[PDB]
Amino acid sequence: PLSETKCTLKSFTVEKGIYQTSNFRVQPTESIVRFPNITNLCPFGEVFNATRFASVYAWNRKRISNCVADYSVLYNSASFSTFKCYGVSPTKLNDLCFTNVYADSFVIRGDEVRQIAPGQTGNIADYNYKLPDDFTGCVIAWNSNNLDSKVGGNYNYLYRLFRKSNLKPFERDISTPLQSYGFQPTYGVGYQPYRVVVLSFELLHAPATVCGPKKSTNLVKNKCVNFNFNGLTGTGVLTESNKKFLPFQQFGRDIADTTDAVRDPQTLEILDITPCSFGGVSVITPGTNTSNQVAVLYQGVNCTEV
C-alpha cells in the first residue's frame, strides 16, 4: 500500500496526506438459484403408462403444449429396454425448450425395434409407420410382453401385415389379411411385442410452450451471492424484510426504479436485494522522508473479516 500510493501518484516520493489509491469490492461467495414449484406437473403417464394402446397403423398423436416436459424419467429410471435418440443426447432433452411436442404411441414386435429409423424400409416401415429423412426426434421403447400379449394373439392391434402400396412418413391409415399375428408370450424375445412411443419435436418462431430445465439449490442470507430466481440475474445481499407484496406482484423497485427485492417463486417469502459492499481505498501515510508506516481506510463500510 505504500507503493500503491507511488503507483497512483506516478512518483517515487509520497507527500504527507491521505490519497485514494484504489477501490474495493467483495466478490460473491456462491450462486443461489430457486425456481417455482416443480411438484405435481403434467406427466407422461397418459401415453406411457396407459392400459391399452392402438396398433401400428392406428397410432394416436397426443399434443404436448402449455406444460412442463420432464425427460429425466426416461433414461435415469433404467426401466426401459432400449432407445434411439437422434441429434441430441437424453440429457440435452431437458435443457431445451420446444414449441410443440407430439407423442405417437404404438406397439411393435421385438425384431421391429431396429426397423424404426429415419429413411428406412421394412414390414412396418413402408406399409405402416415411416420416419422422414429430416426427423430429429427421440424415441424410447420398452416391453409389453407381460401385458399386451395374449394366448393365440391379441385382437386389439391385429398387426396388419399387407398393404397394396407404401405409406408416406407420418401417415395414418385407419382404413378397414387380418389374419392377426400371434402375440402369445411363449414366443422368444424377437417375436414378443414392445411398446414404442415416438416424440416429435418442432422449433418455430413462436415462443416455446414447453419449459426447460428445472434446478434449485439452498437459499443463504446475509452474504454476497449471485442470485437468479426465474426472472433476473444479479449479485447482491439477500435479506428477508417485513415488506408485503400482492400475490400477483413479484419484483419491487426503489426510488431509482432499481430492483430492491425479490419474492421466492416457490415458497412464500420476501427478501430485499442489497448490493454487496464496495468503496474506495484510502491510504494514510506520512512523507517518504518520515517513515514507511501506512494506514488503509475503507470508506463507508464496516470490516467483518479482520
Partner: peptide
C-alpha cells in the same frame, strides 16, 4: 429537509464531511 441509501446502491458514494455538526456549533 432513505434517499441516500438508495443512491448508494447504484454506485453513487456520499462522502461524510470532515467538519461534523457538533464542532460547527462550538465554533459558533
Amino acid at each position: 429537509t432513505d434517499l441516500i441509501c438508495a443512491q448508494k446502491f447504484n454506485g453513487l458514494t456520499v462522502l461524510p464531511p470532515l467538519l461534523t455538526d457538533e464542532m460547527i456549533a462550538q465554533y459558533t
